[PDB]
Scaffold this active site. Structure first.
Site, mmCIF file in Angstrom:
data_model
loop_
_atom_site.group_PDB
_atom_site.id
_atom_site.type_symbol
_atom_site.label_atom_id
_atom_site.label_comp_id
_atom_site.label_asym_id
_atom_site.label_seq_id
_atom_site.Cartn_x
_atom_site.Cartn_y
_atom_site.Cartn_z
ATOM 1 N N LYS A 75 0.824 -1.203 0.000
ATOM 2 C CA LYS A 75 0.000 0.000 0.000
ATOM 3 C C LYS A 75 0.860 1.255 0.000
ATOM 4 O O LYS A 75 0.638 2.174 -0.795
ATOM 5 C CB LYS A 75 -0.926 0.002 1.211
ATOM 6 C CG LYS A 75 -1.914 -1.126 1.236
ATOM 7 C CD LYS A 75 -2.964 -0.913 2.299
ATOM 8 C CE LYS A 75 -2.363 -0.766 3.672
ATOM 9 N NZ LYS A 75 -1.329 -1.787 3.931
ATOM 10 N N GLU A 80 0.385 6.052 11.082
ATOM 11 C CA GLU A 80 1.334 5.173 10.417
ATOM 12 C C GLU A 80 2.744 5.496 10.888
ATOM 13 O O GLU A 80 2.991 6.515 11.531
ATOM 14 C CB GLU A 80 1.236 5.290 8.897
ATOM 15 C CG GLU A 80 0.166 4.406 8.312
ATOM 16 C CD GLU A 80 0.570 2.947 8.275
ATOM 17 O OE1 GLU A 80 0.332 2.234 9.272
ATOM 18 O OE2 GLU A 80 1.115 2.509 7.241
ATOM 19 N N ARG A 81 3.675 4.614 10.539
ATOM 20 C CA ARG A 81 5.006 4.642 11.128
ATOM 21 C C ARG A 81 5.634 6.019 11.005
ATOM 22 O O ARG A 81 5.550 6.665 9.962
ATOM 23 C CB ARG A 81 5.896 3.611 10.444
ATOM 24 C CG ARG A 81 5.798 2.244 11.050
ATOM 25 C CD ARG A 81 4.536 1.551 10.638
ATOM 26 N NE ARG A 81 4.580 1.196 9.235
ATOM 27 C CZ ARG A 81 5.286 0.187 8.758
ATOM 28 N NH1 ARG A 81 6.002 -0.565 9.577
ATOM 29 N NH2 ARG A 81 5.273 -0.064 7.461
HETATM 30 N N1 LIG Z 1 6.704 -2.609 -6.569
HETATM 31 C C1 LIG Z 1 7.338 -3.383 -5.663
HETATM 32 N N2 LIG Z 1 8.416 -4.113 -5.997
HETATM 33 C C2 LIG Z 1 9.058 -4.888 -5.108
HETATM 34 N N3 LIG Z 1 8.681 -4.998 -3.827
HETATM 35 C C3 LIG Z 1 7.612 -4.326 -3.359
HETATM 36 C C4 LIG Z 1 6.869 -3.459 -4.272
HETATM 37 N N4 LIG Z 1 5.876 -2.918 -3.561
HETATM 38 C C5 LIG Z 1 5.977 -3.393 -2.297
HETATM 39 N N5 LIG Z 1 7.018 -4.229 -2.179
HETATM 40 C C6 LIG Z 1 7.422 -4.936 -0.946
HETATM 41 O O1 LIG Z 1 6.588 -4.529 0.131
HETATM 42 C C7 LIG Z 1 7.347 -3.981 1.203
HETATM 43 C C8 LIG Z 1 6.743 -2.658 1.622
HETATM 44 O O2 LIG Z 1 5.414 -2.902 2.032
HETATM 45 P P1 LIG Z 1 4.490 -1.676 2.461
HETATM 46 O O3 LIG Z 1 3.742 -1.210 1.252
HETATM 47 O O4 LIG Z 1 5.304 -0.704 3.261
HETATM 48 O O5 LIG Z 1 3.445 -2.386 3.439
HETATM 49 P P2 LIG Z 1 2.027 -1.697 3.678
HETATM 50 O O6 LIG Z 1 1.377 -1.778 2.326
HETATM 51 O O7 LIG Z 1 1.390 -2.555 4.731
HETATM 52 O O8 LIG Z 1 2.375 -0.304 4.114
HETATM 53 C C9 LIG Z 1 8.763 -3.803 0.721
HETATM 54 O O9 LIG Z 1 9.677 -4.341 1.675
HETATM 55 C C10 LIG Z 1 8.838 -4.556 -0.582
HETATM 56 O O10 LIG Z 1 9.603 -5.750 -0.426
HETATM 57 MG MG LIG Z 2 2.438 1.558 5.236
#
Ligand SMILES: Nc1ncnc2c1ncn2[C@@H]1O[C@H](COP(=O)(O)OP(=O)(O)O)[C@@H](O)[C@H]1O
Ligand SMILES: [Mg+2]
Ligand SMILES: Nc1ncnc2c1ncn2[C@@H]1O[C@H](COP(=O)(O)OP(=O)(O)OP(=O)(O)O)[C@@H](O)[C@H]1O
Ligand SMILES: Nc1ncnc2c1ncn2[C@@H]1O[C@H](COP(=O)(O)OP(=O)(O)O)[C@@H](O)[C@H]1O
Ligand SMILES: [Mg+2]
Lengths: 187, 467, 501, 62, 48, 469
Positions: free
Chosen positions: F154, F180-181
């Site tokens: 996300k 969020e963080r």
């Molecule tokens: N386009 C992408 N390519 C590679 N890895 C991705 C991509 N989008 C997300 N990730 C993976 O997701 C992780 C980040 O997730 P994040 O979006 O921060 O979690 P949330 O959606 O719960 O906030 C990264 O460590 C990465 O490995």
């Molecule tokens: Mg997040």
């Protein structure tokens, strides 16, 4: 249980229960007026600094409070009903809200003698002759026998006119509310 | 005695008597309405106040209205003049035909028959339907349970049971529509008027309908089966005769009880049902018994929520059922009517100590042959008829003949098939099946038996269509 | 303007009155606890001093729990609540048609005020058992699947259940649009005055919806109530009854109405909030004990009056949303055991391309054969049997070959019928065109035509029938049956057309 | 009807206003700003064509 | 034209009620009390 | 006026007034606090008392502290002077750069636009992301949601939307991080400074920031959403502009409400959520709609506890969106980033009248083939792929090709995959998927379509993979 005579007005809560009990018990034996006198007396007698201080501390053994109340009631020579009620409140632990009881009882005794509350909030200061005519006309709203307890109030916050409360009935003829009404029906 | 309302919380009213309280379950009339509003006490809360559950919409009630204590629980008329009429829970007719002029009145809250009254001999109720009376016999004073949904002939079976019981045993019937959709209530009324169980002209009706609609407050859907129980208890007691009692549905009785219990604030039980589920069902399924004066059979439709046969409601109902009748759709495509399934329909009295050795041997043989044919059906479908020997083809032919012979032409269903209603007595059913199993008719075409009464009519039909 | 402002001022009501009154003790979460109002009827409309409304819902012995019809930011402990003495009521009539009203019948459309004359309560009782008469007339929804396999008579509750974004509102709006052909014609025994209650939707969605309706010029006979997501809980709990009363006016005025609740699972949530804040005991899933009485007393107003009470009618199509096909949840089962049917929608079907995504296996209508026209009855009986036969052995589809020619025929017929049932969006079809298409489908005039092309055929056929043989369609429509002459003529048209393509 | 001084109060404020209607009294430049913004938006919704003539077309044949 | 009319309408309102609140400070107290008390008289007269 | 604190339970303070009570939603300033502590009134308990949720830690509060009634709800600065300035829930800078010198203060608790003001127009938005632009096109000026559990992508996806749309967007923008963080806070801050959208030298910033990151008390996480929403509402109405409004998460808002609901004396609803979940979300999510005065394109990252889309929070939020792109973990663990689910994703502007026959039918073909592949997987589980039909293996191969083709290397994911960011104009996505569905690439390997932009890159990758073979 034994049939009990209901009050004219109903008050609710702890004070409601205690006041209703006292009123019904007093109606029997017909001691309402002297009961109210003694209630007013205990009002102050429970406001003395020592009495009002030893009856808030929760570390005074309950029996100690009961006996102190008994002694004070002997000194003040209360009727059996009022002394018993003070006792009752003492051992049930609900004496911290004694002022709520007597106040409620007053409201129950007032309506017994038929003194309906009223109130006239005025746009600003008001003459007395105006107050005379106001009382004379408001007496037209009571029933046959009732009395008026009118508490006038001044209010420049409203624009004009006045607000009249009679028991619950409420007639608002303040220019302010008229202004809001016209603006609303106009918008 | 006249109390005054002091609270109106949803459909739970709270009245404050002074002179003397009404004992629990008393019916109070709310003064000042135009529609008769009847409350029923459910608790005493001290301070000379009672918490009553209202039996009709409680909008417009004013703190302080006068509530007049009737004196005894909800009372209804129970004469024979309650036959062919519709009356809501409190006993007020809703058929727009006038007052239910009766000389008797009965309280809907009467305790179950004492232990001495109970009759110790488990009899069999001859319904006159071959399949029901053979494989899943209905027992007098037993709480039969009618499974199956709509479109499979559940109303027609109800009307047929009513008619057959009125003819054979000379006993009337009742129909307590708990939670009865208004549309389906009207449709059932007119179906009965058609079929003739209800007669508007001569006062020779065989059904005393009672309807607690699906919109009437919950407090008045829990007590619309006790009304039917009381109407039927009058017949059993004051006229000593057998009775039917259809409770459609018996899952809305528990639903209404659960809603009422929730309203009174009681903690919900296992699955949200009321804490008193078992006893609430017991104090109503326990007046449906055969005393020495008469008997009250009962055919209760059952809905099994989410197909959970462990669910507390269908698990508390099944502790009382003395039978079962699984109307199925798959047997209606073949046209075998009634659709009653022979292999699912259970019955606790299908034991040779009760029905008799002949009845039991015949019924068990029919079950075994039908099971074997159902199994061979798979082999035939997969591989082909060639795969089967004649030692199996004979059982297949017998099973097809039996499946045919179980169908019966109902009298009320004359509008559909035109055939005449056949009320085949028990002995004739037993003989017919014991003979079809003994191979005595392995040559007649199957259509000889399709939609006939006794076996002799099947012989005659075979002769007719064979020329 | 100014000159108009003069009579705008004059046209007022300055008079005052001696009215009862109670003062607010408490407020918060949208629930006032008024003290006083000793003579206030349960479920009555009180007015706060600031200007809001409230519905005195919970008459407790010492105070009356009122529920505010708006943000209570304007209310304070001490304000004055004056009772009006009148149970909640709403305007009705034919003045509403074409307007957009909120839960209390106040035009939120701009577009001038509502000129209604007669009002009507919201807590009336449903017609009894005698007034109703069996459901006999059909309500052409214009959708092939709904209109042939799961029919809908006039006076019948037909739940429209299904998961999120499967096309429930789309079915309802196709139904609304289809009524244009009747509502423009002459006969008053076929005019349906659709209503649409929007609960919990956001005002953007209702705006887009009224835009769709206006484009198709389907507003001249539609009311659109709206208790949208921002309107306080009481206005969502109360909108369905406003709609049902607006429809009851037509029903008891010898007219035919149709009311669409969308959703009925966002009214039960609002009622749950109201109850939990009033502190009424909770139940399963936290719903109170009335969340059945709630719906039941609403969906039991959809009746079909007899000919002594006028002959009116009021259909009802409560849209329910189920969380991932959990039909066993509390509200879905509460509203499935009140209504006379269900049109189940599924996403596996929606993404396979079967749009509208109706799942004929689970969808049923408990009126059935009735509520269809004899022509559609003749076609749909065979269609339904063929589709059931196909469904019971569709499991083999992925193999198809290696199997008996009989099941191969069954699959080759079921695939064609499934492709015929697919329909576009906002393209409802008169019953005669549906009959023509499904006749060309169930009589085998496509079995030799590859499935991928069936849709094409369908459209072409309609264009080749509407523009060419309107006389035959009129013959089918005026008398809703297929006389042998009409049958043979349909056969000839189908055969010759298929030959010419 | 003039008994209620509120009616006359509103009436003659109204009158004085109409007399002042030689211009929109106390419009305030924020009035003009609102006019500006909404008039643009309205125009773009109505297009950019000069709102004074019959924009010619000279229609094109196949 | 429609926007012109509505916007000038709301402005006229704004101005008019602002002048209402400005002007109601004028001296009519005794007169207002007289009319209101007569109105209570009429309300009581119709009361019974 | 001036009241006194009578009770302090958790993060809920009951204050007793002797003068006139303050209306609900007012702001009360607790006196004698080194850091401004602001309570919001939320009830009137009767007996001249109020109950208030505190926007800062209640450590050190003493029964009897004097409390000043402000007079009006929480008021925050607004204007073009809050651009590039991080803000608290109560609009006070937390970037250590001095007060926010503004001229207009706005109160966070406003009303939604009425029905007469709604704008009924809608037209596609180009985000330069294959899956999003194809199967779930984003309406311009329409509410958009990014569902999906934790760790699916996300935040990365919103980082991409900020990177693409923000700079290429004329009007202002706002990012209102809710619960969020705090690490992502300065990560975004520094990224934006690098991009230049925020400048610490000139007044040329384009993005305002609001932060109620999850170390704040629950009282201050249920309202920071309203602060960011207020700033964007001003930029829409008063500035007569078009605005982007990013929120992340908008589930911490309902969770933060749930945290304090119980202390306010409320029975708990279905899953422990407050009884007033739906309407508390409605009164917020309906101040974000586009109106006739201005346009707001709102992108909201909606958490989904335990990847359960049936939970009351997301289940309710689904009704307040135009385009919902449901990221899935089942697809993120196949390496298909973005993890979007091509079947759960939906949009309101996926009607042929608004995207045309070519785009609509390409999208519906893609969805049909993916669903058919899902159906076949059940069989492949038993048979094995060999025993399949011969026309089916074609559909499975095409579905795998399409599934891999929907992935894409993001500009902000250069640090995860080491790839180079790619953008794909809508027409090119349509071309590529048309070609794949038609079979024009049925000869290429599947791994040719993994993490590539336009289809031409797919053919180039197929070459470079076949060379090293
Ligand atoms: N386009 C992408 N390519 C590679 N890895 C991705 C991509 N989008 C997300 N990730 C993976 O997701 C992780 C980040 O997730 P994040 O979006 O921060 O979690 P949330 O959606 O719960 O906030 C990264 O460590 C990465 O490995
Ligand atoms: Mg997040
Ligand atoms: N017959 C159809 N043909 C093609 N697409 C359709 C059809 N019916 C519905 N859809 C699509 O389904 C989507 C959702 O439609 P709709 O809003 O009717 O479902 P819904 O369940 O009411 O949505 P929600 O539950 O979110 O309100 C629409 O975008 C529409 O494009
Ligand atoms: N004995 C029978 N002979 C022929 N048809 C029957 C028989 N019993 C039932 N049916 C068929 O089953 C249907 C049952 O419908 P009905 O009794 O009205 O409601 P339900 O389907 O719920 O029982 C009838 O329409 C009838 O055609
Ligand atoms: Mg919808």
């Amino acid at each position: 249980f034994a049939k009990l005579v209901r009050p004219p007005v109903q008050i609710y809560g702890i004070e409601g229960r205690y006041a209703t009990a006292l009123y019904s018990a007093a109606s029997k034996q017909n001691k309402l007026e002297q009961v109210e006198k003694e209630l007013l007396r205990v009002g102050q007698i429970l406001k003395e600094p020592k009495m009002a201080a030893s009856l808030l501390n929760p570390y005074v053994k309950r029996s100690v409070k009961v006996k102190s109340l008994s002694d004070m009631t002997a000194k003040e020579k209360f009727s059996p009903l009022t002394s018993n009620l003070i006792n009752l409140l003492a051992e049930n632990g609900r004496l911290t809200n004694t002022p709520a009881v007597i106040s409620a009882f007053s409201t129950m005794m007032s309506v017994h003698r038929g003194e309906v509350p009223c109130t006239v909030t005025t746009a600003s200061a008001l003459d007395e002759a105006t107050l005379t005519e106001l009382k004379t006309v408001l007496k037209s709203f009571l029933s046959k026998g009732q009395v008026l307890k009118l508490e006038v109030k001044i209010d420049p916050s409203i624009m004009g006119g006045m607000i009249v409360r009679i028991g619950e009935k409420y007639v608002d003829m303040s220019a302010k509310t008229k202004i809001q009404k016209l603006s609303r029906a106009m918008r | 005695t006249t109390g005054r309302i002091v609270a109106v919380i949803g459909a739970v009213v709270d009245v404050q008597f002074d002179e003397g309280l009404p004992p629990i379950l008393n019916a109070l009339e709310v003064q000042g309405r135009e529609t008769r509003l009847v409350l029923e006490v459910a608790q005493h809360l001290g301070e000379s106040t009672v918490r009553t559950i209202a039996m009709d919409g409680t909008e417009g009630l004013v703190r302080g209205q006068k509530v007049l204590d009737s004196g005894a629980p909800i009372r209804i008329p129970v004469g024979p003049e309650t036959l062919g009429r519709i009356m809501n829970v409190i006993g007020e007719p809703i058929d727009e035909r006038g007052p239910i002029k009766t000389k008797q009145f009965a309280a809907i809250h009467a305790e179950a028959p004492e232990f001495v009254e109970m009759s110790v001999e488990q009899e069999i109720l001859v319904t006159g339907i071959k399949v029901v009376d053979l494989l899943a016999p209905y027992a007098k004073g037993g709480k039969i349970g009618l499974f199956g949904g709509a479109g499979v002939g559940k109303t027609v079976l109800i009307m047929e049971l009513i008619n057959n019981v009125a003819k054979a045993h000379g006993g009337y019937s009742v129909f307590a529509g708990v939670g009865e959709r208004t549309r389906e209530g009207n449709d059932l009324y007119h179906e009965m008027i058609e079929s003739g169980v209800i007669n508007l002209k001569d006062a020779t009706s065989k059904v005393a309908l009672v309807y607690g609609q699906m919109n009437e407050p919950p407090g008045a859907r829990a007590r619309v089966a006790l009304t039917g129980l009381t109407v039927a208890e009058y017949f059993r007691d004051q006229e000593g005769q057998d009775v039917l009692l259809f409770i459609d549905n018996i899952f809305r009785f528990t639903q209404a009880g659960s809603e009422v219990s929730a309203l009174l604030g009681r903690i919900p039980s296992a699955v949200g049902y009321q804490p008193t589920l078992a006893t609430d069902m017991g104090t109503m399924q326990e007046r449906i018994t055969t005393t020495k004066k008469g008997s009250i059979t009962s055919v209760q439709a059952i809905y099994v929520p989410a197909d959970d046969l462990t669910d507390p409601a269908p698990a508390t109902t099944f502790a009382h059922l003395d039978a079962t009748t699984v109307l199925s759709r798959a047997i209606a495509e073949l046209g075998i009517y009634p659709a009653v399934d022979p292999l699912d329909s259970t019955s606790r009295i299908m034991d040779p100590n009760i029905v008799g050795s002949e009845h039991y041997d015949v019924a068990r043989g029919v079950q075994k042959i039908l099971q074997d044919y159902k199994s061979l059906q798979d082999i035939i479908a997969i591989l082909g008829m060639d795969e089967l020997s004649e030692e199996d083809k004979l059982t297949v032919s017998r099973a097809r003949k039996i499946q045919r012979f179980l169908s019966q032409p109902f009298q009320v269903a004359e509008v559909f098939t035109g055939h005449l209603g056949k009320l085949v007595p028990l002995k004739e059913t037993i003989k017919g099946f014991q003979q079809i199993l003994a191979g005595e008719y392995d040559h007649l075409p199957e259509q000889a038996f399709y939609m006939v009464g006794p076996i002799e009519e099947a012989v005659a039909k075979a002769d007719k269509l064979a020329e | 303007v100014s000159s108009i402002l003069e009579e705008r001022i004059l046209g007022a009501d300055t008079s005052v009155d001696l009215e009862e009154t109670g003062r607010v003790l408490s407020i918060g979460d949208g629930i006032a606890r008024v003290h006083g109002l000793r003579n206030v009827q349960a479920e009555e409309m009180v007015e706060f001093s600031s200007g809001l409304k409230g519905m005195s819902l919970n008459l407790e012995p010492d105070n009356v729990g009122v529920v505010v019809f708006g943000n209570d930011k304007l209310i304070k402990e001490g304000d004055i609540v004056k009772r009006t003495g009148a149970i909640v009521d709403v305007p009705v009539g034919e003045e509403l048609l074409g307007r957009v009203v909120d839960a209390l019948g106040n035009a939120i459309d701009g577009k001038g005020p509502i000129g209604s004359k007669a009002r009507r309560r919201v807590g009336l009782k449903a017609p009894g058992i005698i007034p109703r008469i069996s459901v006999r007339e059909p309500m052409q929804t214009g959708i092939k699947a709904v209109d042939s396999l799961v029919p809908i008579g006039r006076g019948q509750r037909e739940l429209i259940i299904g998961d999120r974004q499967t096309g429930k509102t789309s079915i309802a709006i196709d139904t609304i649009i289809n009524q244009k052909r009747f509502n423009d014609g002459t006969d008053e025994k076929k005019k349906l005055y659709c209503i649409y209650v929007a609960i919990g939707q956001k005002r953007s969605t209702v705006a887009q919806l009224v835009k769709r309706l206006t484009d198709a010029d389907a507003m001249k006979y539609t009311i659109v109530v709206s208790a949208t997501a921002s309107d306080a809980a009481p206005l969502q709990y109360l909108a369905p009854y406003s709609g049902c009363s607006m429809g009851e006016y037509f029903r008891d005025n010898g007219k035919h109405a149709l009311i669409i609740y969308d959703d009925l699972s966002k009214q039960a949530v609002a009622y749950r909030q109201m109850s939990l804040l009033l502190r009424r005991p909770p139940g399963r899933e936290a719903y109170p004990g009335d969340v059945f009485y709630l719906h039941s007393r609403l969906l039991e107003r959809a009746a079909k009056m007899n000919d002594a009470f006028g002959g009116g009618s009021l259909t009802a199509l409560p849209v329910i949303e189920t969380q991932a096909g959990d039909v066993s949840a509390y509200i879905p089962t509460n509203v499935i055991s009140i209504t006379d049917g269900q049109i189940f929608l599924e996403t596996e079907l929606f993404y396979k391309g079967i749009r509208p995504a109706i799942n004929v296996g689970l969808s049923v209508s408990r009126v059935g054969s009735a509520a269809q026209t004899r022509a559609m009855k003749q076609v749909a009986g065979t269609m339904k049997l063929e589709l059931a036969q196909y469904r019971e052995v569709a499991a083999f589809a992925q193999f198809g070959s290696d199997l008996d020619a009989a099941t191969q025929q069954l699959l080759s017929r079921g695939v064609r019928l499934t492709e015929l049932l697919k329909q576009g969006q906002y393209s409802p079809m008169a019953i005669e065109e549906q009959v023509a298409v499904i006749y060309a489908g169930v009589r085998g005039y496509l079995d030799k035509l590859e499935p991928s092309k069936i849709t094409k055929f369908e459209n072409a056929f309609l264009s080749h029938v509407i523009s060419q043989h309107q006389a035959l369609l009129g013959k089918i429509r005026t008398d809703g049956k297929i006389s042998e002459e009409s049958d043979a003529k349909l056969k000839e048209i189908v055969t010759n057309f298929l030959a010419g393509f | 009807d003039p008994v209620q001084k509120l009616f006359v109060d509103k009436i003659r404020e109204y009158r004085t206003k109409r007399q002042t209607s030689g211009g929109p009294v106390d419009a305030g430049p924020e009035y003009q700003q609102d006019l500006d913004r909404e008039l643009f938006k309205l125009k773009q919704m109505y297009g950019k064509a000069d709102m004074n003539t019959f924009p010619n077309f000279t229609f094109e044949d196949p | 034209q429609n926007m012109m009319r509505q916007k000038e309408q709301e402005h006229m309102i704004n101005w008019v009620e602002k002048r209402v609140v400005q002007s109601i400070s004028a001296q009519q107290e005794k007169e207002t009390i007289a009319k209101c008390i007569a109105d209570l008289k009429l309300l009581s007269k119709k009361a019974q």
